[PDB]
Amino acid sequence: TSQVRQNYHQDSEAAINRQINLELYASYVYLSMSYYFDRDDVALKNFAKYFLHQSHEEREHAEKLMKLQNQRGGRIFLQDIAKPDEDDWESGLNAMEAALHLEKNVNQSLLELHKLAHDKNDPHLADFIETHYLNEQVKAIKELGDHVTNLRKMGAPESGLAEYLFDKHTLGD
Amino acid sequence: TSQVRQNYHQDSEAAINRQINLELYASYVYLSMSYYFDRDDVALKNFAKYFLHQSHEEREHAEKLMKLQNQRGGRIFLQDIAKPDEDDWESGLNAMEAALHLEKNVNQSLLELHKLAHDKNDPHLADFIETHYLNEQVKAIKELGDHVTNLRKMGAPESGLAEYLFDKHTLGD
Amino acid sequence: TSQVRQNYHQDSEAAINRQINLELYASYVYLSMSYYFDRDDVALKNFAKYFLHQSHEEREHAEKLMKLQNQRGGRIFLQDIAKPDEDDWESGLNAMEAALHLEKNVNQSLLELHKLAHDKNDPHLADFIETHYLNEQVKAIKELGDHVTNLRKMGAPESGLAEYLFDKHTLGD
Amino acid sequence: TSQVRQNYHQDSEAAINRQINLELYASYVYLSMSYYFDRDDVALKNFAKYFLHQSHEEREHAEKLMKLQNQRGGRIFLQDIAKPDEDDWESGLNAMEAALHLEKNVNQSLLELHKLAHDKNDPHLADFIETHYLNEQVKAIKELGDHVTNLRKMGAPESGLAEYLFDKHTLGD
Amino acid sequence: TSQVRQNYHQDSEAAINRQINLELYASYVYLSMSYYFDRDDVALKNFAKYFLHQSHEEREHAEKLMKLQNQRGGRIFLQDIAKPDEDDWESGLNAMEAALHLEKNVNQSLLELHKLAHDKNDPHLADFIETHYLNEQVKAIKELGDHVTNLRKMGAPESGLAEYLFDKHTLGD
Amino acid sequence: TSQVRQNYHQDSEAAINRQINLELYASYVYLSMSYYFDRDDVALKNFAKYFLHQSHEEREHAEKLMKLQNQRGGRIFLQDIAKPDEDDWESGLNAMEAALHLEKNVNQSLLELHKLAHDKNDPHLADFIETHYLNEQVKAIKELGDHVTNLRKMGAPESGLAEYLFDKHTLGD
């Protein structure tokens, strides 16, 4: 056992490792999304840029969890990073929906993480989740839904013009 | 076939995808290394910082290959990211040796990539490899060996003082 | 023979002259394209501006090849500059496709030039082509295809609005 | 007929197209001259630079005529660009004389253009020629003759020193 | 064998050592040239300054090759530096011709070095030669020939005035 | 005989040429030393940097002697530059001792040069040696001995840590 470890359960430790894996996977998902829009036959640079930024942020989420793992005297054990469920994301619209879905997945897991933290009465962990992750996830989910809403109203994905103008007017400023 | 595709072989395309996977794996390896030194029972902050920076750079290598894939009208197809061969890296010294080994792996693959590019007479690809990757890899390999050399001379890894002072005097400036 | 000439084949010399002619022709093509969009019954100022800039750059490509010709002690011999294949380019969309086609022509010729350089083992010439021309051409081809892709999706060329908005949102920033 | 067309004769329209061709040819002539002086066995950098600048300006003359063509609702129809009458210009002195001759050619054509404009009472065209072209041509002709005069007096072209010093003292400031 | 060594042939290693020797010799040649023009009975300060600068640059070429030798895990083994073929260079004109000759020697050797690198498929070495040496040599050769050309035309070396004025007007700015 | 020559003996002239050769050799020695420490299996960057700087300075010493040779109307005649006595310098410690030895060699020769100058009552030469060389050599000798002293006390060369820390704390500031 680590010399710094205090009130830090083996159950929490494993769940953190899993969350780490989950954050890294989301990064990989967003990476996949970004360069799809960079394809010459898709060509939506702001969609590409948007998702690439998202991708880097998710890595930042993972890194922040790993330090936390070390802070508590838990131990990081990494697992394989799964390839995304798709290679071709079909459209700006399909990707935003998939991104919405992903974050609800990541968010629920974090909420489950909080429940576990609370059940073990580890308030340091509970506030860490609250402060750095929960509202971010909430915010992320609202933004993606806002994006989803606008794209539908504009006539996406059939109107290629709709996605183009959205790329330009929303993601490029 | 992509409208932009010209003189870009299916063999090159697959090898690029593999190189992409390899660069992402190296990022993950360096990520693993970094936070090991962040463990409370290792506690070498500059080793940690060093490898974290390395990690981000490797991602940058991958991202640069993916755009390139799209530039030529090839198609990115992602594969799983393998977990590193180890969880506990033993020492500053062991990690630098493992990092040396990794880059020789990544570098040889790039050299094999260049051979393939040359055999297919795709000079755009050959110069891309030359310009952005080959000298970087060469440089990376020299630096890690320099690090290896110094650590041995100082009495690493048995002298914990050796690694401490190296962390301080080499990696912290 | 020139006093500066070294390892510079008569075959290379003639091919450079031809490349010079080809770069000047592309300049003329882009010149033709630019002022078509400047017609009162077309009236797409950013298309016009875009192609005019392209035109000047191609001249720059030619000039850079001519100095190179003199650098190696080869001799510049100019040939007539052919008029473009069309006078009326029909649309923003048709022109971008024609521009895509032109650059693939110019790029293949440069790749053939590189093959010739390589067959004669003239690495100065090979790197010159690699460094100043090959990636530029690659980049040019991706950009035009990106432009092509977006215009199709928006409903060009039938939607005159599509071309207008593209002119405004893509070429005017 | 163009919606903007007013008092713009079909005869003027064709003559403008011809003038456009003539300006582009002069650009090509000056281009040829410039890089001759860039040859290693000629090596007069300021002669080279001088003519290259001249070349770009002539293109500017052509471009200004093409917009004008579109302004009046005439239509630009491009023709082949003829190669210059020579490949080897012999000397700084021979080139300046040839340049003097070229501008007198271009200037007379413009004066003939003005006569045509005046005969058709198209004062917009007459002032356009007066304002942007006629005095420039006049100025160009004086300067080349000044250059011619000085070179003769110095002992050009036999004195290679004469041309060298002229290159240095006149064209390099 | 060095720990950093990868795809680096013993043949390349020896040829690099030879190139190192060759670059150091050129430095010594230019050193000899520089101070000849510094003699009171020659007294061409800009010729002197010109060659001295050239000399320092060649050393820089050698130093860059030596680091490269170490980068690849090859080993630097130095050999004697030969005295130049002459002590009295006769004139500004004779020296420029000798310098032209020297660089063609150095350049051919580098081209032979590239051939060897290519035959061993060591693209790192091939691009290193391309990037840092080949165009520089090409450029150097053009400049010396330009200098040669001008000096002949001016009446050098018999006209002492020719060399004086060249020293002043070309090398002193 | 040179027009500027006054009170400048043929014996002095030859000894200056020899001193020139000696200064160039020391430069070459320091060059050899510098890049040894740049080897991956030595890896002492400040030792490398230290000796490289020393090397450039020695060249400066030679150049200053050559101008002086020309100032007096003596004539520079260059001789071959000998390779250093060793290729592998063993250690930071061994090199500093060898450098100490070299400068005592160079310094004695200069002192012998001064004796010759004095015997010929050439006070210009005597003060030139005094002012630009003698104290520099004296200073150089003290510094190297200071370096030698510190390295011994620290436990060099067996303590690889000793040399590392010296590299860091003395040569890197």
Ligand SMILES: O=C(NO)c1ccc(C(=O)NO)cc1
């Ligand atoms: O026929 C004529 N005179 O007998 C005549 C010729 C030319 C002009 C003129 O300058 N028009 O612009 C006016 C009158």
Ligand SMILES: O=C(NO)c1ccc(C(=O)NO)cc1
């Ligand atoms: O044997 C050959 N052709 O018959 C041959 C010679 C040289 C190359 C080459 O350029 N390697 O880099 C490839 C093939």
Ligand code: NA
């Ligand atoms: Na997220």
Ligand code: NA
């Ligand atoms: Na809270």
Ligand code: NA
């Ligand atoms: Na709370």
Ligand code: NA
């Ligand atoms: Na790497």
Ligand code: NA
């Ligand atoms: Na290259």
Ligand code: NA
């Ligand atoms: Na190359």
Ligand code: NA
């Ligand atoms: Na082009």
Ligand code: NA
């Ligand atoms: Na003109």
Ligand code: NA
């Ligand atoms: Na050189």
Ligand code: NA
């Ligand atoms: Na010294």
Ligand SMILES: [Zn+2]
């Ligand atoms: Zn997240």
Ligand SMILES: [Zn+2]
């Ligand atoms: Zn990499």
Ligand SMILES: [Zn+2]
């Ligand atoms: Zn080859």
Ligand SMILES: [Zn+2]
């Ligand atoms: Zn081009």
